[PDB]
Short mmCIF file of C-alpha atoms and ligand atoms in Angstrom, two decimals:
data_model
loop_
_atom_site.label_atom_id
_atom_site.label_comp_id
_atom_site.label_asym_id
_atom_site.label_seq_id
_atom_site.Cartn_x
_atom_site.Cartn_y
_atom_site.Cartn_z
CA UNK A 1 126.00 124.70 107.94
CA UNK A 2 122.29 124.04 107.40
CA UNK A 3 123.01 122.54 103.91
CA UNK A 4 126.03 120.08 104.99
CA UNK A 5 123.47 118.97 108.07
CA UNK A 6 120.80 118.02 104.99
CA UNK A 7 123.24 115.96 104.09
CA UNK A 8 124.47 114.60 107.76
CA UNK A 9 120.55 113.79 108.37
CA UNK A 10 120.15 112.46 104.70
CA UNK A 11 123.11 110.25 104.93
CA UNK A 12 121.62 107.65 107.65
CA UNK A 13 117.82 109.06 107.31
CA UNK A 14 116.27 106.40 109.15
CA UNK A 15 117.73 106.70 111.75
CA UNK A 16 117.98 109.74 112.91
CA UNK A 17 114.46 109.95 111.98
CA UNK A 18 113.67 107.32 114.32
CA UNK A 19 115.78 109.13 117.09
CA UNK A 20 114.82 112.42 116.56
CA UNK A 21 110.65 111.73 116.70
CA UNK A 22 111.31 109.65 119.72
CA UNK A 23 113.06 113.08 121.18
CA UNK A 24 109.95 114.32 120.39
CA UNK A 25 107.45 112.02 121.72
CA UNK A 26 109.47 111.80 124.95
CA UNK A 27 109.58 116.04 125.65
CA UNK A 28 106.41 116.05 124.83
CA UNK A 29 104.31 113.13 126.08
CA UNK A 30 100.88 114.50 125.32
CA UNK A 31 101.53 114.64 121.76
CA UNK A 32 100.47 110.92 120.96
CA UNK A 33 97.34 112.09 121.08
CA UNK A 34 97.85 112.48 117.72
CA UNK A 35 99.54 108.94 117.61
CA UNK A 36 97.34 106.22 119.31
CA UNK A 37 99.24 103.43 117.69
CA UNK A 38 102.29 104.37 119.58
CA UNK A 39 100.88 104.27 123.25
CA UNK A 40 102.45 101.87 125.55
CA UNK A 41 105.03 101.03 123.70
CA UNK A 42 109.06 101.98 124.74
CA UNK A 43 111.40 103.66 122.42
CA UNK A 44 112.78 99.94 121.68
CA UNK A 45 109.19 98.38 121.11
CA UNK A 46 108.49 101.24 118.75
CA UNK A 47 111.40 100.98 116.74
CA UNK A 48 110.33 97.19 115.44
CA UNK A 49 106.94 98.21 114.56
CA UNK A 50 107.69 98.46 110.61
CA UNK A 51 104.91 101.53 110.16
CA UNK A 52 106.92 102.97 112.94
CA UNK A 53 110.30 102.70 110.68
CA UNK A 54 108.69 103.41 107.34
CA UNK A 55 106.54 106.50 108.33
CA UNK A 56 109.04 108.17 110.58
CA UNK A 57 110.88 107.95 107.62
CA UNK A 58 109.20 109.21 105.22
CA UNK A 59 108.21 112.38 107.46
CA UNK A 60 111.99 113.40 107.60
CA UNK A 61 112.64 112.59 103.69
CA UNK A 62 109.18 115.10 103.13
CA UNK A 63 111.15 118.04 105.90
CA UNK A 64 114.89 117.31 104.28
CA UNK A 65 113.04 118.11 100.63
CA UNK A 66 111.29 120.99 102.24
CA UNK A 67 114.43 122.45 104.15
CA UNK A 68 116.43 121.96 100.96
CA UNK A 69 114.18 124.18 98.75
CA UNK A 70 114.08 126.28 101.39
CA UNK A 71 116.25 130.17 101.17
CA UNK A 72 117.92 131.37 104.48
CA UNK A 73 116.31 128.78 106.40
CA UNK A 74 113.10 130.55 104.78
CA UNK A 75 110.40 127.24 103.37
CA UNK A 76 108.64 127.59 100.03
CA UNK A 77 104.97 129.12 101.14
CA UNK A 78 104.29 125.86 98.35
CA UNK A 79 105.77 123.66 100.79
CA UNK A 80 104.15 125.15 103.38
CA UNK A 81 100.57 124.88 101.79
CA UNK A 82 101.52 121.05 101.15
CA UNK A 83 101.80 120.10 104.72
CA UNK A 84 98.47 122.70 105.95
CA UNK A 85 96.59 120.76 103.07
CA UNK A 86 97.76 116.91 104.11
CA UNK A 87 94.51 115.06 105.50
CA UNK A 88 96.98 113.59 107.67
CA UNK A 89 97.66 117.07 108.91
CA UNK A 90 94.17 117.75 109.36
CA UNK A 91 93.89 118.20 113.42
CA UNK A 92 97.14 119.44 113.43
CA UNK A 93 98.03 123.31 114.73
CA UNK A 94 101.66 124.92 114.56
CA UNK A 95 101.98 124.44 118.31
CA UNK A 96 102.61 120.30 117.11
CA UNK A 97 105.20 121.75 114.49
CA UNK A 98 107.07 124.06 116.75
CA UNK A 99 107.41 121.57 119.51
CA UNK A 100 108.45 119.15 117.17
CA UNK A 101 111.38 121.42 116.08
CA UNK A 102 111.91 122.62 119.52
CA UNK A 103 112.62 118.70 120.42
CA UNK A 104 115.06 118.44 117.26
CA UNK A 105 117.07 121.60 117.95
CA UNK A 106 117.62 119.77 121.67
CA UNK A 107 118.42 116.44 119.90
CA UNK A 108 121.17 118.37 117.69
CA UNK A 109 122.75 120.45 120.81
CA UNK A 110 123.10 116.99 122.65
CA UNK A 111 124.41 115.21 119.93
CA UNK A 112 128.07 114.58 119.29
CA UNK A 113 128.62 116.34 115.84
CA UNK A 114 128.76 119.52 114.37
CA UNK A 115 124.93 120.94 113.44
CA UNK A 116 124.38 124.15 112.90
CA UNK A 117 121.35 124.03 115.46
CA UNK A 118 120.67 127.98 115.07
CA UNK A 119 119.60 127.13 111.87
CA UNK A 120 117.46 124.69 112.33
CA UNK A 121 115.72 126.70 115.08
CA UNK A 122 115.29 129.39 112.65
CA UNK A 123 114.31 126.89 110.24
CA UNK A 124 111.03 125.36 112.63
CA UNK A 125 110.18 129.18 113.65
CA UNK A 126 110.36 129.70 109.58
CA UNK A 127 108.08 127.00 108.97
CA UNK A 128 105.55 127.49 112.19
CA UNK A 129 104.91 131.15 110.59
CA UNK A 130 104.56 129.65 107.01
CA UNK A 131 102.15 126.95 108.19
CA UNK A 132 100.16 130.07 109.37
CA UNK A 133 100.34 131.81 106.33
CA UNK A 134 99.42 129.18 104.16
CA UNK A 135 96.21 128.79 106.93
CA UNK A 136 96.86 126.30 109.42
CA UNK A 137 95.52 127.19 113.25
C1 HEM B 1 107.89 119.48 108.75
C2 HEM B 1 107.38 118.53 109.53
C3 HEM B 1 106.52 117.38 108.97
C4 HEM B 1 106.57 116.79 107.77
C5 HEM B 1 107.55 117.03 106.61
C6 HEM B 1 105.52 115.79 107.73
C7 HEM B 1 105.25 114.95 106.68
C8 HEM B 1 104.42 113.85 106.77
C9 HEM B 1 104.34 112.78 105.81
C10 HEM B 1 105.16 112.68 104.51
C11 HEM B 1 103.44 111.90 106.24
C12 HEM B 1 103.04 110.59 105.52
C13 HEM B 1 103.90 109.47 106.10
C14 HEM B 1 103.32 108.11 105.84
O1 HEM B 1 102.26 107.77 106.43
O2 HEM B 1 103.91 107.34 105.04
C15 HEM B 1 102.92 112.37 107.50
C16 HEM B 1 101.94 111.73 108.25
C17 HEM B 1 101.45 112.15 109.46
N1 HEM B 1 101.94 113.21 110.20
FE1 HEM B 1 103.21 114.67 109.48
N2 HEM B 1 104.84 115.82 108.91
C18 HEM B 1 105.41 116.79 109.70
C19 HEM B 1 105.01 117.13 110.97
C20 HEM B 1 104.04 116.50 111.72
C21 HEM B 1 103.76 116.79 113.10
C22 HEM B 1 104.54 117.86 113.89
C23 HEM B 1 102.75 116.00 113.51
C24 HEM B 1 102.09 115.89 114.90
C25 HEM B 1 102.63 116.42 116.01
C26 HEM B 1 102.38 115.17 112.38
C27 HEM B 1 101.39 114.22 112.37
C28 HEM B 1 101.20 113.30 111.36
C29 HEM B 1 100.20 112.24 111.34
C30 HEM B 1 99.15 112.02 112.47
C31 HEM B 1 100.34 111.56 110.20
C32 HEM B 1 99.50 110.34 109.73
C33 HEM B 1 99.67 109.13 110.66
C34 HEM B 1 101.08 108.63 110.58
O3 HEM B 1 101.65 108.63 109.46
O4 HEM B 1 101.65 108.25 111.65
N3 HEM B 1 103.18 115.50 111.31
N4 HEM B 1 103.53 113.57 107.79
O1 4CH B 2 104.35 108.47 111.54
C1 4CH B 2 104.84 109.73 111.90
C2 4CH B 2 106.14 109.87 112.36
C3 4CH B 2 106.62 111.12 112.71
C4 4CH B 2 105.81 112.23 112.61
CL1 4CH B 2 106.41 113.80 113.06
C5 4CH B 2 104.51 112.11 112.15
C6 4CH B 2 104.03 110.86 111.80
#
């Protein structure tokens, strides 16, 4: 279930961070607009940049934290506030968020193992109405 795949994902973070945001920036191409420093660059290039490793990274450790407080695949509307109130976040809309999820729940249904990828869609749609409610466009 959604709280063995925590684990799965925790287990070798890096990685499938690295995969699962390059799932994401392949779907959906016009999204490094928000990521100029990853232009021109193919999946390999990207994965020896070391900001490339590190941040990808640390995005995935930030959603495994905020899907494992999470109830029924529910997020904290704390956890939600966090990530409205990031400057980092601060062009961001839930249309980036929901794509984003919509790339991972691919990435698990294509994958060899066993995720529970209901979940996790019910997880992003979860979080994409908490972003709103905590007051992101
Ligand atoms: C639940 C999903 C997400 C979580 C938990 C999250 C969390 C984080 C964290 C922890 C950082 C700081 C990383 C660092 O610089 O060391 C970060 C940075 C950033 N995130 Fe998010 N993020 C999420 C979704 C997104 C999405 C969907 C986008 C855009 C489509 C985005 C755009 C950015 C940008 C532009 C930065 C700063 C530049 C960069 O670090 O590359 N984030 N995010
Ligand atoms: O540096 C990064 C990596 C992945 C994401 Cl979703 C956002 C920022």
């Amino acid at each position: 279930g959604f709280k063995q795949d925590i684990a799965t994902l925790r287990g070798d973070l890096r990685t499938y961070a690295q995969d699962i945001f390059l799932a994401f920036l392949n779907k959906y191409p016009d999204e490094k607009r928000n990521f100029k420093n990853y232009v021109g660059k193919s999946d390999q290039e990207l994965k020896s940049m070391a900001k490339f490793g590190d941040h990808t990274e640390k995005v995935f450790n930030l959603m495994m934290e905020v899907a494992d407080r999470a109830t029924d695949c529910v997020p904290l509307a704390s956890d939600a506030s966090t990530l409205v109130q990031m400057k980092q976040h601060s062009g961001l809309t839930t249309g980036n968020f929901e794509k984003l999820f919509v790339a991972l729940v691919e990435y698990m249904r294509a994958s060899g193992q066993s995720f529970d990828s209901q979940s996790w869609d019910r997880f992003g749609k979860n979080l994409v109405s908490a972003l709103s409610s905590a007051g992101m466009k």
